[PDB]
Design a protein around this ligand. Structure first.
Ligand SMILES: [Cl-]
Ligand SMILES: [Mn+2]
Ligand SMILES: [Zn+2]
Length: 520
């Protein structure tokens, strides 16, 4: 227990069912075709249906929710964005030209020798980068008035076809000369050399020396596409392109220059960026001098030790529900089956290992079976047991668990076992609800995303995937009325704030709201 447990106005039991969504279509809907009388009552009258997919939880529009994103958003009380989502939103709404770090890189150039470098993987593979981000950056840097911009094109062939690079090179060349009339291609080199992540500095050195010294084949805008096509016929593909050099010494990285790397994945950026921006050029052991007074910038942060500013730096995830309750000196309980323990732990608590002060944990072991359709109740009963024991104790004014059956059985695709899963989950919830009533907890049932509600493809085939359907949010306490946000659908990010409002605890500013209940 914790010193301010008595300040709590209403103790709360939160259940996160895993893979339990709301769908009107009953064909292959294991929740609808399962005896679920407990949830059928809890999901009626005062109850809400909230989003767990797509942008509502920091994912690309249209993408199904999943267990990690779900538990992250639930426990965080804010939307937890993917980096790629953050970047693409910024492209949609012209927020590059106001980006503080990008404005910083550009101002430094403008008040120095004004030379800027763009370097990254040029393709639409979308794993490490996107060429549209590169395009969007050139336009931005143009608007901001940087005098000179040179581009260092890293060839892909791994997240795209090995002979796709000519197309992106053509498309880059036309963009710079006809669309922006600004920016110049200075280098082409394969990601094999520039985006090594196994500390093979002899590979990095190839891209290093090309950028700073022009160690490659000379070409120009008129010839460069032919060079690459000749390389293809020599059996050298995008990934493995040896360097090509386009603007002479003007396009090299020189003294006092600024560099922006536009990849948003870090592992394959740490080496080239540390070679340019710290002391790792020494590992390349080049006979070339290292330029003086460089400053590097990254689309994202590649290593917190690095001094590099970032266009989209990491969110700290400060004052997620678990940390915040401990700050208020209120104690808590987290419980789950094996298969979902990282969800009520690592991910609920912000995506780290921290178990905060006053946080008590319980791991109920999952059954040892080959597939979970062979025991579709899994260990939900045991999880309920431990939760009911905490309700009898009354020690923790906030307790929570996860029930795995609906998701983990849904993934098998066996429709009738899914039905059993949801039946066994519903019985478990019913046991806790009885206990909350007897020991005066308010019960709240939600889910992290759907799954069980769609078990069949239109044609009857197995459908094992997660869904984009909304999920329930129930509240047994009759002095509150559910109310939607005025500006958006409610979403997982509103579970934690709503919890704190029922508990009479303040909300921390990092929790970008919002309680979706109001008192009667
Ligand atoms: Cl080589
Ligand atoms: Mn799953
Ligand atoms: Zn899940």
């Amino acid at each position: 227990a914790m010193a301010n447990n008595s300040s709590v106005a209403n103790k709360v039991c939160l259940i996160v069912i895993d893979g339990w969504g709301v769908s009107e279509d009953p064909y292959g809907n294991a929740i609808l075709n399962a005896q679920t009388p407990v949830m059928d009552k809890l999901c009626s009258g005062n109850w809400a249906q909230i989003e767990a997919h797509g942008l509502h939880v920091g994912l690309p529009e249209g993408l199904m929710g999943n267990s990690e994103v779900g538990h992250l958003n639930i426990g965080a009380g804010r939307v937890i964005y993917q980096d790629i989502v953050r970047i693409n939103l910024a492209v949609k709404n012209n927020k590059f030209v106001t980006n503080e770090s990008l404005v910083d890189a550009c101002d430094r150039a403008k008040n120095g020798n004004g030379r800027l470098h763009l370097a990254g993987l040029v393709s639409d593979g979308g794993v490490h980068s996107h060429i549209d981000h590169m395009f969007a950056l050139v336009k931005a840097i143009k608007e901001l008035g940087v005098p000179e911009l040179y581009l260092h094109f890293y060839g892909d062939g791994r997240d795209t076809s090995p002979n796709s690079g000519v197309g992106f090179l053509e498309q880059t060349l036309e963009f710079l000369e006809k669309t922006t009339g600004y920016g110049k291609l200075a280098t082409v080199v394969g990601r094999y050399y520039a985006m090594d992540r196994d500390n093979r500095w002899e590979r990095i050195n190839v891209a290093y020396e090309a950028m700073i010294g022009g160690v490659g084949e000379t070409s120009d805008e008129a010839g460069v596409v032919e060079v690459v096509r000749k390389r293809y016929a020599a059996d050298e593909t995008d990934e493995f392109l040896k360097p090509i050099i386009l603007q002479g010494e003007k396009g090299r990285v020189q003294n006092d220059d600024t560099i922006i790397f536009f990849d948003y994945r870090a592992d394959r950026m740490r080496e080239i960026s540390a070679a340019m921006g710290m002391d790792r050029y020494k590992d390349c052991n080049s006979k070339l001098a290292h330029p003086s007074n460089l400053q590097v910038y990254g689309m994202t942060q590649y290593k917190a030790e690095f001094p590099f500013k970032s266009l989209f730096p990491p969110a700290s995830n400060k004052n997620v529900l678990a940390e915040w309750l401990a700050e208020q000196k209120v104690s808590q309980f987290h419980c789950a089956e094996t298969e979902k323990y990282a969800h009520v732990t690592f991910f609920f608590n912000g995506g780290l290992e921290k178990q905060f002060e006053g946080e008590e944990r319980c791991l109920v072991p999952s059954p040892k079976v080959a597939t979970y359709d062979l025991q579709p109740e899994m260990s939900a009963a045991g999880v309920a047991d431990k939760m009911i024991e905490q309700l009898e104790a009354g020690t923790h004014p906030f307790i929570m668990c996860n029930f795995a059956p609906p998701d983990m059985v849904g993934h098998t695709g066996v429709y009738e076992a899914a039905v059993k899963a949801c039946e066994a989950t519903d019985i478990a919830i019913g046991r806790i609800y009885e206990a909350t009533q007897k020991h005066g907890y308010s019960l709240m049932v939600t889910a992290d995303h759907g799954n069980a509600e769609k078990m069949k493809a239109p044609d009857g085939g197995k459908h094992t995937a997660h869904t984009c359907y909304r999920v329930p949010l129930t509240l047994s306490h009759p002095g509150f009325k559910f109310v939607d946000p005025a500006d958006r659908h409610p979403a997982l990010c509103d579970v934690a704030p709503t919890v704190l409002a029922i508990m009479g605890l303040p909300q921390p500013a990092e929790m970008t709201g919002v309680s979706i209940v109001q008192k009667i």
